[PDB]
């Protein structure tokens, strides 16, 4: 990978720059020149949704910083917001298909039934009839409990339609 930390920095968009300039201008509150030591960076972590300690950020600055002064800069800072993917609990593949569950379920009954499936068919431009709905729960259902569920739609989305 041609520079994984400097790539995002050197490749900054003008839209995210106007947002970092303000967020970065607050992290330097109390400092002298306009940077962040460790306690000032604690506010940067709280933004995502975490309250780490100022002692754990110090060891993280020497790995991102490229000078050796013991402080973060407008450049070494953006690097910290690049190594963390945009997903703390989510992931991919099996996590990307779970999104269909929302549009598939309507009242959180498990997944879809004879009345809920009518919405998943209307979203598709394909022509749907009454025989296509009764067939959806036929092979689409493995337990035949009356509706479907994430465990069933998992294989149903393996290229069936
Ligand atoms: Ca530095
Ligand atoms: Ca439902
Ligand atoms: Ca079932």
Curated annotation (Swiss-Prot):
InterPro entries: CALM/Myosin/TropC-like, EF-hand-dom_pair, EF_Hand_1_Ca_BS, EF_hand_dom
Presence of the UniProt keyword Calcium in the record: yes
Coiled-coil regions listed in the entry: none
Domain EF-hand: start-end pairs: 16-51, 52-87, 92-127, 128-161
Binding site for Ca(2+) 1: 65, 67, 69, 71, 76
Binding site for Ca(2+) 3: 141, 143, 145, 147, 152
An example Gene Ontology CC term for this record: cardiac Troponin complex
Keywords from the named record: Acetylation, Calcium, Metal-binding, Muscle protein, Repeat
Residues annotated to bind Ca(2+) 2: 105, 107, 109, 111, 116
GO MF: calcium ion binding; calcium-dependent protein binding; troponin I binding
GO BP term, example: cardiac muscle contraction
Keyword field contains Repeat: yes
Stated role: Troponin is the central regulatory protein of striated muscle contraction. Tn consists of three components: Tn-I which is the inhibitor of actomyosin ATPase, Tn-T which contains the binding site for tropomyosin and Tn-C. The binding of calcium to Tn-C abolishes the inhibitory action of Tn on actin filaments.
Stated family: Belongs to the troponin C family.
PANTHER family registered for this protein in UniProt: MYOSIN LIGHT CHAIN 1, 3, TROPONIN C1, SLOW SKELETAL AND CARDIAC TYPE
Leftover remarks: Slow skeletal muscle Tn-C can bind 3 calcium ions per molecule. Domain I does not bind calcium.
Protein name: Troponin C, slow skeletal and cardiac muscles
Gene symbol of the encoding locus: TNNC1
